[PDB]
Write a protein that binds this ligand. Sequence first.
Ligand code: T3S
Length: 124
Amino acid sequence: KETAAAKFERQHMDSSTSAASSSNYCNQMMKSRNLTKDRCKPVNTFVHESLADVQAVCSQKNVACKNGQTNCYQSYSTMSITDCRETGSSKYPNCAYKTTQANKHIIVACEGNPYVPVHFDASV
Ligand SMILES: Cc1cn([C@H]2C[C@H](O)[C@@H](CN3CCCCC3)O2)c(=O)[nH]c1=O
């Protein structure tokens, strides 16, 4: 079974491209990472940095999570990310996404021993 840490890697980690994220990127990635099976997941972010660099965020700037929990952390440096957002014309099972590349600070929720990212909260 998939651990919370593994689910985070599946949903949010893409170290393979630095930031080319073609116009096709989100359409392909949302599908391949199995985020279009139950429904079209409406919003998702992929981070183009090393797993070590993202895991390190759990020891960086402690900030409140959107849900009010205290276990969120903001990266000290900007990171290469791609936001995927479902279009209006997207109809399941043909999930369609707008691909947006940017360089922003990420905010992740961390849990466990080892203390690792388990949720992507925001980018700022
Ligand atoms: C704001 C933001 C959210 N997400 C993901 C994390 C959760 O799976 C989901 C949380 N949230 C649920 C309610 C509002 C829309 C999104 O979206 C994401 O992947 N990147 C983001 O920048």
